[PDB]
Ligand binder design. Structure first.
Ligand SMILES: *[C@@H]1O[C@H](CO)[C@@H](O[C@@H]2O[C@H](CO)[C@@H](O[C@@H]3O[C@H](CO[C@H]4O[C@H](CO)[C@@H](O)[C@H](O)[C@@H]4O)[C@@H](O)[C@H](O[C@H]4O[C@H](CO)[C@@H](O)[C@H](O)[C@@H]4O[C@@H]4O[C@H](CO)[C@@H](O)[C@H](O)[C@H]4NC(C)=O)[C@@H]3O)[C@H](O)[C@H]2NC(C)=O)[C@H](O)[C@H]1NC(C)=O
Ligand SMILES: *[C@@H]1O[C@H](CO)[C@@H](O[C@@H]2O[C@H](CO)[C@@H](O[C@@H]3O[C@H](CO[C@H]4O[C@H](CO)[C@@H](O)[C@H](O)[C@@H]4O)[C@@H](O)[C@H](O[C@H]4O[C@H](CO)[C@@H](O)[C@H](O)[C@@H]4O[C@@H]4O[C@H](CO)[C@@H](O)[C@H](O)[C@H]4NC(C)=O)[C@@H]3O)[C@H](O)[C@H]2NC(C)=O)[C@H](O)[C@H]1NC(C)=O
Ligand SMILES: *[C@@H]1O[C@H](CO)[C@@H](O[C@@H]2O[C@H](CO)[C@@H](O[C@@H]3O[C@H](CO[C@H]4O[C@H](CO)[C@@H](O)[C@H](O)[C@@H]4O)[C@@H](O)[C@H](O[C@H]4O[C@H](CO)[C@@H](O)[C@H](O)[C@@H]4O[C@@H]4O[C@H](CO)[C@@H](O)[C@H](O)[C@H]4NC(C)=O)[C@@H]3O)[C@H](O)[C@H]2NC(C)=O)[C@H](O)[C@H]1NC(C)=O
Ligand SMILES: *[C@@H]1O[C@H](CO)[C@@H](O[C@@H]2O[C@H](CO)[C@@H](O[C@@H]3O[C@H](CO)[C@@H](O)[C@H](O[C@H]4O[C@H](CO)[C@@H](O)[C@H](O)[C@@H]4O[C@@H]4O[C@H](CO)[C@@H](O)[C@H](O)[C@H]4NC(C)=O)[C@@H]3O)[C@H](O)[C@H]2NC(C)=O)[C@H](O)[C@H]1NC(C)=O
Ligand SMILES: *[C@@H]1O[C@H](CO)[C@@H](O[C@@H]2O[C@H](CO)[C@@H](O[C@@H]3O[C@H](CO)[C@@H](O)[C@H](O[C@H]4O[C@H](CO)[C@@H](O)[C@H](O)[C@@H]4O)[C@@H]3O)[C@H](O)[C@H]2NC(C)=O)[C@H](O)[C@H]1NC(C)=O
Ligand SMILES: *[C@@H]1O[C@H](CO)[C@@H](O[C@@H]2O[C@H](CO)[C@@H](O[C@@H]3O[C@H](CO)[C@@H](O)[C@H](O[C@H]4O[C@H](CO)[C@@H](O)[C@H](O)[C@@H]4O)[C@@H]3O)[C@H](O)[C@H]2NC(C)=O)[C@H](O)[C@H]1NC(C)=O
Ligand SMILES: *[C@@H]1O[C@H](CO)[C@@H](O)[C@H](O)[C@H]1NC(C)=O
Ligand SMILES: *[C@@H]1O[C@H](CO)[C@@H](O)[C@H](O)[C@H]1NC(C)=O
Ligand SMILES: *[C@@H]1O[C@H](CO)[C@@H](O)[C@H](O)[C@H]1NC(C)=O
Ligand SMILES: *[C@@H]1O[C@H](CO)[C@@H](O)[C@H](O)[C@H]1NC(C)=O
Ligand SMILES: *[C@@H]1O[C@H](CO)[C@@H](O)[C@H](O)[C@H]1NC(C)=O
Ligand SMILES: *[C@@H]1O[C@H](CO)[C@@H](O)[C@H](O)[C@H]1NC(C)=O
Ligand SMILES: *[C@@H]1O[C@H](CO)[C@@H](O)[C@H](O)[C@H]1NC(C)=O
Ligand SMILES: *[C@@H]1O[C@H](CO)[C@@H](O)[C@H](O)[C@H]1NC(C)=O
Ligand SMILES: *[C@@H]1O[C@H](CO)[C@@H](O)[C@H](O)[C@H]1NC(C)=O
Ligand SMILES: *[C@@H]1O[C@H](CO)[C@@H](O)[C@H](O)[C@H]1NC(C)=O
Ligand SMILES: [Zn+2]
Ligand SMILES: [Zn+2]
Lengths: 165, 321, 321, 165, 320, 165
């Protein structure tokens, strides 16, 4: 949507992947599987948990507020009272609804950034070491095993390129 | 190696700024909609359940409100929307709504006989009741006030004083009777002048009977107007009268407290210990908002007219391997 | 192949968060600024145009309000800020401002003669007018009240009752008159003690006349205090007096409704229809905000003090290569 | 602005292009012109139409709101009335002005995202098929006719790259 | 060539969404918390500092409020929470809280003697005081009201009028006395019925004395109920009474103005010329929010309960 | 954070750099140092100054708001005044606190965009003239002196590529 990852050049998610929000789907000769990311997931969890906690924190608990019973020569004070009660309800409803609505697009795009930020740091690591297909995938000229695979999160590479050109 | 994102079976619909109906992996309801349905306790302490009585009747002692006279502590007060037991003997309730707002702060009572029926009024008959205030088949009267009448063809000048030594404000009530005929006035108080003085250091009022024919309510043509004043610690209240004084019998030493209130609700009582009570029911308050009722008691979620308030936490859901 | 974006010559200014005066391709005035300039109708129905009369005069029937007595249904009320007719006979209008608010709820009237002038008061002279309340050169009085005077040197004991069979609340109006001399009191009502009792099941008040000299207002040294009460279905109201009663002649059976109001405006009337009315003029509401007036009537956009409320829809505009 | 497309690496807009917010200006030997995009355009209108309507929805119409006209002994109650009426007008005036102000930067950046999202998806299609000049244009190694050019909307290319090195 | 961003030694913490304790290179206070601690002036004009008197005692002239009688202009009013000088002689102050609001609007006075002590009341004694209103060791009374008493065994019918030719609204105060005994009533005014009429063109009220025994407040068993009304330019006010009238002596031609108000404060007076004043102190207003006090006077920042209001201007700070 | 530059592929700021928010650290034979950028820096200062000023502007100065003193029989009106006074302070508190909280994230994301947008416009400048290490740095194969290095502000290059493939 706002960033090009979701529904853009990576048009989908993987039901197979659990244990995190982001990760990889390696298709190796030594087995395949959905190894879910760790650093970017828990970092996103920290942020959204703070988002939520930081949103309800800003909302005081409504302590006792009860009706007021005005008299027959008090229609005016009765209407003014209702004008206040309704006016504040109106303000808190709008403040509440307008916050989730606006903050929803921001939360979704936040994940968009996290994924697009993960698409890099790997395109940036595999500078000339892998083929970039426009579906969010990388074809290794390497036959990268389960040792260098966990070495895409970090890396002190057997860097020399072997020819496939 | 491919980079992608999580997905689940979640059917959680959510609204964004540029897109409606967005299904997502994780979210939070953020708004309380379900409630307990019953009038529960509040952090253990129970509410003053008024039953068929109105505040006017409870605090005046409408004989039909016999059972409420005991309770002197509470977290909140409940009134039926249409309580049929109040001012059984008609009259104006001077500042009724204010006395209600007065009692909304009270957390405890100390009902005591300011002017004991026996020994407060010798020389005046106090055995006076009305069928309007009938209780258990026989005519009765309010339990907290007391109807002074002539005794042996005389209503001698009256003077009773009370000194507030309770170190708390004393909610004193009293009333004035206005006969319909000149006959009842002379036959009842043996005079047509009839004054009524009620004096504090902060309250003074002289009452006079306006005699006239009025439409019969509770088959009564007369009326009794109900007055009252809180009496500060150290202050003294002086009652003087020539007739028509419905003397105070029981008073209340009020102890003020935090957030209590009067609510109207027809839900039944149960034994649940709710942290929040509303006219519709209790709420197990954890969410920041609520939509069952704007009236609330205890520590509760902010009331809003909203229906959804979802707030996604996860991301877009795109299944199908 | 090139990737770029649209552009036009639009001069639509917009204030963004990091830059003011930002020109953009498309936008929309989210705030209504123009108004109709006239007092229009409201979904077809016309408003009660009070003209030179104030609420005080229209409801009491200031003879100079000859023309307002017909209208008995309406969408809203218009009043001149300083209406020149109103009371005309000096005095206090007990609870004036509330009665204005009472009629602000009213959607229709049924003015009826609770006590018909002819045949209501035999043995009492009812032919009473004042130069202070003059209409068409002649002395007059209110169309809805009535000044009773002694007849044949006698003001016999008065007791007139009305029982509400209109199954609508009946606004009962009346007044008490205060002469400046003891002569006027004695010469007019044939007694100096003078009582005036008005008693319902929800209203009871005894009035007594205070004689004294007062500054001349409308060339009158006396005063007439104007009272009123709503009488609920089934209830009865009893007027008794020994003199000084300005008896009710016409009262009103109210039908309550939603959405009316009292507005002050100098804008003229037209036949335009409109969903929203303001003292400034009608508003053709499609936007959520407006800034012509905080007072508003009907379905209108919420009022704000803002001037722009622009809200771009498109993107930046960059013409000329 | 937030993204580099508008006023950034595409320093101007095209008065020539109508029929949409984004599009292309192809320079082929078989004629040139401003073929305006459709998919990203109607998709963007949907969202801005949603934002606007989802914003005015959160603003209930007023209704009759009338003055209260107090007497000479009700000065306190008059100020409280003036305090409520004014206090609410302010809360709504501020909110309304602050809403367009904040949400305008959001909409402008949204078009930026959309344009930058379209500058991609063509670099993702023309992997080795053209020279990328940073003015938002691509000079082709191919002689892409007016048949494959409209195949930039989707792309089912007679793909083999021709050398131009 | 490397592309990067700035950083400094700043310890400026900021709370953003999704991350607390976020240190940043630059920010701005956005919330005023410090205050002057003293009662300042307001764009030069000084406040009506009432001392031990309450507004009731100030406007009625509690003789112990001698010094407040001079000042006739002020920017705001300061009152002690529990001032012991006010209605020295017991009685009720009719619409007292409103008269506070009326005066809270007032910006200037013209105190003048509506009914001069000498010559206003011949045939009536005016030399009457109460130990309740004691000043400087001697019994006294209010400076602005006046106690009419019977003279030579007679309290003849009373009737006085006043014409507002002051081209400003004139606040007139008066009182009605209720003796505790019928004895005191007969010896003081020489009659037992006793009416008291007060009539303006839009104000009328007839007071009658209610004699009864009451608890002694300021060792007095009697009471004086205090009334007052505004008299518009042109209006005349008519006083009639048979006895028990606490007559007006000094009245006030009121001048209305813009935002003034009454505040409660124990802060001292200073010579500072502050633009905003609160019970806690003055505020050197430049920020949009503040949290020293909800009570405020003049052009001031909106009061809020907040503690922080950080608002970064720079970017994240990452040394090492 | 939202963009990948700050705390992402550029893991820190430079204490050495003063005189601006963004800039460069050239490693040349004619001396090295932290040359602070000018165009994007003042542009960010302009934007941040309007944010602040455009935000305090939306806050009209609180005029005299003082207590109201009710009598012994006006508790209802006494509470109503408190309900209005508090209900509004609650609204202004939330509006004030929630504004800095959300708009702080926007400001950081705003700076992130600017640095990442500065990382571009140089890749668009140094099309083939330098090896990009994903650390926000460029090692030139060129021997760009302090004359052409100061030409990264504009760029009129002794363009010929040197054989380094
Ligand atoms: C608020 O106001 C009303 C009236 O004050 C009151 O409730 C209604 O009226 C009575 C209370 O006066 C309710 O209960 C009654 O109980 C009596 C008999 O039951 C026993 O009660 C005690 C304890 O057990 C002992 O004295 C003894 O054990 C009694 O046997 C009796 O008064 C009622 O019994 C029937 O007969 C009366 C005539 O005497 C008749 O009028 C009733 O209608 C009733 O018929 C029953 O109707 C109900 C309706 O479904 C139901 O019980 C059943 O269908 C009928 N009986 C049987 C055996 O099948 C009566 O039981 C009465 O229930 C209340 N009515 C309603 C609709 O609630 C409230 O309690 C008051 N609240 C307060 C004061 O807080
Ligand atoms: C609200 O309040 C005002 C009163 O304060 C009232 O406005 C006036 O209403 C009266 C009617 O009661 C108007 O007064 C005069 O009525 C005469 C009748 O006119 C004829 O009309 C037809 C056909 O010929 C017939 O129905 C009728 O029988 C008559 O044949 C008319 O002759 C008057 O004309 C002018 O003559 C003199 C000159 O000194 C003057 O006294 C009048 O006031 C008026 O003078 C001024 O001249 C011009 C031209 O008219 C005008 O521009 C100017 O505004 C006039 N004066 C002022 C002060 O503005 C006249 O019609 C009178 O016009 C109404 N206006 C004013 C300002 O007095 C409203 O009707 C009340 N509204 C209600 C109750 O709804
Ligand atoms: C302007 O404002 C000034 C204040 O700056 C005010 O002056 C004060 O006036 C009050 C009286 O209203 C004075 O208080 C009195 O103090 C007297 C002496 O102090 C005694 O108590 C203390 C503490 O225990 C001891 O240290 C000391 O040795 C004394 O024992 C005291 O005599 C007064 O008490 C009673 O006396 C009179 C008549 O004799 C009578 O008013 C009462 O009997 C009174 O009160 C009694 O006690 C309680 C009060 O708590 C009361 O409820 C009870 O009903 C009373 N008892 C009876 C039997 O009725 C009184 O306490 C004070 O000293 C003055 N000065 C100062 C500096 O405070 C002026 O009066 C004001 N001027 C105006 C308004 O014109
Ligand atoms: C405590 O609370 C209880 C409620 O639990 C109160 O009791 C209830 O309220 C009434 C008073 O006791 C009782 O109402 C009755 O309704 C019956 C309807 O037919 C009938 O028994 C009476 O109502 C009318 O009936 C006749 C018509 O044929 C009349 O003769 C009769 O007098 C009544 O007439 C008129 O009613 C209208 C009402 O619209 C009035 O406008 C008129 O004024 C009435 N006529 C006259 C001449 O005045 C009877 O009223 C009801 O039974 C009773 N019991 C219950 C269980 O509800 C207690 O009173 C209360 N006690 C306190 C507060 O002390
Ligand atoms: C309905 O409204 C009309 C006005 O729209 C109202 O009629 C007006 O009433 C006043 C008072 O009667 C008039 O104003 C007068 O002006 C004339 C001359 O221009 C003066 O004679 C009056 O002066 C006073 O005279 C003495 C000196 O002060 C006083 O002893 C005396 O009490 C007078 O007040 C006064 O200044 C005005 O002319 C009329 N007419 C118009 C067209 O305004 C009418 O009374 C209202 N209806 C009812 C039933 O009252
Ligand atoms: C408010 O109320 C209180 C009491 O009701 C009152 O505080 C009093 O103020 C005055 C003046 O500040 C004090 O009266 C003084 O008492 C002492 C001696 O005991 C001295 O300050 C004074 O004596 C000397 O001072 C001067 C020479 O330099 C001369 O004025 C004098 O002749 C003496 O030489 C004077 O007697 C009183 O003590 C205090 N009481 C306290 C503080 O408890 C205050 O004035 C009231 N404010 C008002 C009415 O505005
Ligand atoms: C919302 O989405 C749910 C689940 O995708 C679907 O069942 C429903 O039809 C949608 N409602 C709309 C679009 O109003
Ligand atoms: C009446 O009571 C008073 C005191 O309360 C007493 O003086 C008098 O003797 C009593 N009369 C009797 C008991 O007859
Ligand atoms: C409240 O009731 C029980 C006891 O606290 C709890 O298990 C339940 O989840 C709560 N309901 C809510 C939070 O809706
Ligand atoms: C007064 O009214 C009575 C009512 O019966 C009637 O006789 C007559 O009209 C009047 N009395 C007279 C004229 O004596
Ligand atoms: C008329 O009424 C007055 C007071 O209402 C009363 O004094 C008088 O006796 C009555 N006349 C009768 C009943 O004939
Ligand atoms: C009320 O009764 C009278 C009979 O005197 C009748 O004329 C009137 O129509 C009745 N009211 C209604 C609403 O029918
Ligand atoms: C103004 O009024 C109606 C009602 O809102 C509106 O629909 C219409 O477009 C406008 N024009 C006319 C002539 O009514
Ligand atoms: C940061 O640096 C300057 C001196 O270089 C100093 O004045 C300032 O106080 C320092 N702040 C710190 C160390 O927090
Ligand atoms: C929060 O405060 C500072 C930085 O703001 C730092 O010590 C750390 O992040 C937190 N405090 C502690 C004691 O860790
Ligand atoms: C006061 O006294 C004399 C009578 O002794 C009287 O003539 C005079 O007019 C009176 N003055 C008034 C009432 O102002
Ligand atoms: Zn019983
Ligand atoms: Zn002195």
């Amino acid at each position: 949507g706002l960033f090009g990852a979701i529904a853009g050049f990576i048009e989908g998610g993987w039901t197979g992947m659990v244990d995190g929000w982001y990760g990889y789907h390696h298709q190796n000769e030594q087995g395949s599987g959905y190894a879910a990311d760790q650093k970017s997931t828990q970092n996103a969890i920290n942020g959204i948990t703070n988002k939520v906690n930081s949103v309800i924190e800003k909302m005081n608990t409504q302590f006792t507020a009860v009706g007021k019973e005005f008299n027959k020569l008090e229609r005016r004070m009765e209407n003014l009272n209702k004008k206040v009660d309704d006016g504040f309800i109106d303000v808190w409803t709008y403040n509440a609804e307008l916050l989730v609505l606006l903050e929803n697009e921001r939360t979704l795009d936040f994940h968009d950034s996290n994924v697009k930020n993960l698409y890099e740091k790997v395109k940036s690591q595999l500078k000339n070491n892998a083929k970039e297909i426009g579906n969010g995938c990388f074809e290794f000229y390497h036959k990268c095993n389960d040792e260098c695979m966990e070495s895409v999160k970090n890396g002190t590479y057997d860097y020399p390129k072997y020819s496939e050109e | 190696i491919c980079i992608g994102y999580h997905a689940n079976n979640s059917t959680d619909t959510v609204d964004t700024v540029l897109e409606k109906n967005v299904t997502v992996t994780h979210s939070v309801n953020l708004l309380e909609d379900s409630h307990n349905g019953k009038l529960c306790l509040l952090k253990g302490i129970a509410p003053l359940q008024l039953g068929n009585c109105s505040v006017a009747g409870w605090i005046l002692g409408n004989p039909e409100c016999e059972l409420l006279i005991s309770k002197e502590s509470w977290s909140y007060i409940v009134e039926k929307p249409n309580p049929e037991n109040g001012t059984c003997y008609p009259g104006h309730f001077a500042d009724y709504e204010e006395l209600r707002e007065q009692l909304s702060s009270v957390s405890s009572f100390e009902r005591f006989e300011i002017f004991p029926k026996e020994s407060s009024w010798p020389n005046h008959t106090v055995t006076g009741v009305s069928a309007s205030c009938s209780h258990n088949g026989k005519s009765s009267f309010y339990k907290n006030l007391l109807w002074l009448t002539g005794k042996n063809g005389l209503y001698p000048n009256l003077s009773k004083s009370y000194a507030n030594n309770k170190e708390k404000e004393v909610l004193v009530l009293w009333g004035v009777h206005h006969p319909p005929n000149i006959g009842d006035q002379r036959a009842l108080y043996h005079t047509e002048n009839a004054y009524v003085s009620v004096v504090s250091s902060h309250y003074s009022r002289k009452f006079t009977p306006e005699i006239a024919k009025r439409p019969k309510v509770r088959d009564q043509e007369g009326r009794i107007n109900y007055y009252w004043t809180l009496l500060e610690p150290g202050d003294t209240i002086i009652f003087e009268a020539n007739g028509n004084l419905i003397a105070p019998r029981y008073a209340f030493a009020l102890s003020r407290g935090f957030g209590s209130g009067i609510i109207n609700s027809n839900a039944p009582m149960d034994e649940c210990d709710a942290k929040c009570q509303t006219p519709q029911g209790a709420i197990n308050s954890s969410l920041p908002f609520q939509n069952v009722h704007p009236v609330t008691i205890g520590e509760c979620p902010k009331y809003v007219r909203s229906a959804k308030l979802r707030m996604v936490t996860g991301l877009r859901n795109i299944p199908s391997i």
